[PDB]
């Protein structure tokens, strides 16, 4: 199986909306998807499992959706503390491409 992330980078300002794209090579159910927040020099953490169930302790601006083979993470109101690389990978984690979100 194969997974692909797009776009490769993003630089925006606060109070705005970001939209990412995570696409599998085949049809994947809505359960084996999770979203990550990797900051440099830190410990990464879970943001969203099963593509809609919000992880405990992360704010409500991180909202994900999608089905079949098209998956999307969306930050509703961008913040200056959201500078991190964001990862979508499967259950067995055998893929991963990376997408960096910068602050303008």
């Amino acid at each position, epitope marked *: 199986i194969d997974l692909t992330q797009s776009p490769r980078t993003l630089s925006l300002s606060a109070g705005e909306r970001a939209t990412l794209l995570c696409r599998a090579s085949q049809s994947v159910s809505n359960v084996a998807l999770a979203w990550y927040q990797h900051k440099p020099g830190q410990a990464p953490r*879970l943001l969203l499992h099963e593509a809609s169930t919000r*992880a405990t302790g992360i704010p409500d601006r991180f909202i994900g959706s999608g089905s079949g083979r098209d998956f999307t993470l969306t930050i509703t109101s961008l913040e200056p503390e959201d500078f991190a690389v964001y990862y979508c*990978q499967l*259950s067995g*984690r055998r893929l991963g491409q990376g997408t960096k979100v910068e602050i303008k």
Partner: nanobody
Amino acid sequence: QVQLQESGPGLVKPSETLSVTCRVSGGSLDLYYWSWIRQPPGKGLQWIGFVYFDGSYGDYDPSLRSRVTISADMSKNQISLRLKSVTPADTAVYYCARLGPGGIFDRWTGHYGDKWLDPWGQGTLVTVSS
């Protein structure tokens, strides 16, 4: 609540055996899987493999299959990773985390609980030089 920490050497010459150790200090190894994740300094995150706490199941990366060995001790609260044929390309950062909610016990039922991946720990750096 569950706090875990990785450990290992810092300088590994080639043609050796890499060996790192992840220790849990917030609970048991029971009812969960245990995994390893690699990040090269230029690229992103890469998956190595994971093992079940009984030692009755393990899934591996097809690239790194025949040189890797993951083991876990239920009593000593630790997980050891071993890697053969150390190259300078293996200079990277290593991460240790427990896998999803499943406690799907057996060889006969089939290991079927694998959804998310909670705490990741700090990580370690392995540099390969002479």
